[PDB]
Recover the amino acids of this structure.
């Protein structure tokens, strides 16, 4: 692997042989376009806990790339684009809404919505897990978190993908026009939700943000941008992970049987899915100062990508790392990051993946609806996710 490129077609559909080489021969690697790639668990964790590997250079590049106006002003304010102290401020505001305690309200909602999504599939004995389970579930869950009407999932998912794809460095004139068009409609939506809370009340996350705005801790734009942040990152990551999880279990029929026979293994089966095929393969940073790493000299202003996908396959951390083992000891992975930017939504994620996998393993005759090889990953670099995952089972469920 002379210069690693995640945009390469081979790497898009199975990056794991590239990773194996990387963490064995070049753990801190200068890849395509002079982007550094960090592979090993120890180093990934090192980078993520270091504020010097920052997001500000990425924000400024992106806002000047999209140009002046509503899109720049709103998406410019997103938490993913901030360093301290703005990052700490926004995280302090929304943080308490994501506690396991604060999220018990959603358990029956999420279990319930998995049921409702399975429901039209049962008599058919077939389903595309991506279209019909993964995406709606993830969108309904993050809407519930916010306190927004869960029936708006489609419209809001669309706005968020149109806006979100505008951060994808491989952009289009078409993507852009749609992004600018969707941010306007999206912003209206949120303002109408805020006004409803202004006049009616609420105890939801959107209400907690509106209150933070009143105490001057958060601007109107920051509320809108936080809403956009959660919906976009909240739904694509979870949806793709539900798909990957089901694939991981279908690919390993014996592991599926074990879980089916031993339902107590659900929690760690999910952990293993997160470990083995994470929907977020990597995260980007840009250095504010020279930093030394495994003898490599990474320069001020260099772009640095940490590979959560590779770090999860690190032999220094995991015995037989390339094997899918649901009975492995649940030892924390990199799938939710570390340090300052650790995943606020990890519990919400787990609740969804547990409910989705529980309901699907419970199905007699569960199998792939197509051939193993006909599967295809989505064209974007931002997440690892299937375009389609047809499954079949015994009609009746
Ligand atoms: C399986 C699904 C998910 C995966 C694999 C995942 C993964 C990650 C990772 C790796 C990070 C660290 C980002 C970095 O270091 O640059 C992160 C951060 C974050 N995630 Fe998640 N996540 C998932 C689901 C969710 C959900 C459901 C939400 C709720 C809306 C959420 C909200 C956030 C937020 C707010 C951050 C903070 C980023 C920052 O402070 O810059 N995530 N996630």
């Amino acid at each position: 692997v002379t210069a690693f490129d995640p945009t390469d077609a081979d790497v898009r559909r199975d990056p794991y042989p590239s990773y194996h080489w990387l963490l064995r021969h070049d753990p801190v690697h200068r890849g395509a376009h002079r982007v550094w790639y960090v592979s090993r668990f120890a180093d990934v964790r090192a980078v993520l806990g270091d504020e010097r590997f920052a997001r500000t250079g990425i924000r400024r590049f992106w806002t000047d790339l999209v140009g002046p106006g509503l899109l720049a002003e709103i998406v410019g304010d997103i938490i993913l684009f901030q360093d301290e102290p703005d990052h700490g401020r926004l995280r302090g505001v929304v943080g308490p809404a994501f506690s396991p305690s604060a999220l018990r309200r959603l358990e029956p909602v999420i279990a319930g919505t998995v049921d409702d999504l399975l429901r039209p599939a049962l008599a058919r004995g077939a389903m595309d897990v991506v279209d019909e389970l993964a995406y709606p579930l993830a969108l309904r869950a993050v809407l519930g978190l916010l306190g927004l009407p869960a029936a708006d999932w489609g419209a809001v998912g669309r706005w968020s993908r149109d806006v979100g794809r505008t951060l994808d460095r491989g952009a289009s004139a078409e993507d852009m026009r749609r992004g600018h068009a969707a941010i306007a409609e999206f912003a209206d939506y949120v303002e109408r939700a805020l006004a409803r809370r202004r006049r009616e009340g609420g105890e939801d996350l959107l209400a907690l943000m509106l209150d933070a705005h009143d105490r001057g801790l958060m601007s109107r734009n920051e509320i809108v941008s936080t809403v956009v942040t959660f919906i976009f990152t909240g739904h694509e990551t979870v949806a793709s992970q539900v798909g990957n999880a089901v694939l991981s279990l279908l690919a390993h029929p014996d592991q599926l049987d074990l879980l089916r026979r031993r339902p107590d293994l659900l929690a760690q089966a999910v952990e293993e899915c997160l470990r083995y095929d994470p929907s977020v393969q990597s995260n980007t940073r840009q250095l504010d100062v020279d930093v030394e790493l495994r003898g490599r000299r990474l320069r001020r202003d260099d772009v640095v990508v940490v590979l959560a996908g590779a770090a999860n396959r690190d032999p220094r951390r995991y015995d037989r790392p390339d094997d899918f083992d649901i009975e492995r000891d649940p030892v924390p992975s990199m799938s939710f990051g570390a340090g300052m930017r650790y995943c606020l939504g990890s519990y919400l994620a787990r609740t969804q993946l547990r409910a989705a996998v529980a309901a699907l393993a419970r199905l007699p005759g569960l199998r792939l609806g197509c051939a193993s090889d006909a599967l295809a990953y989505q064209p974007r670099t931002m997440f690892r996710g299937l375009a389609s995952l047809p499954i079949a089972f015994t009609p009746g469920g």
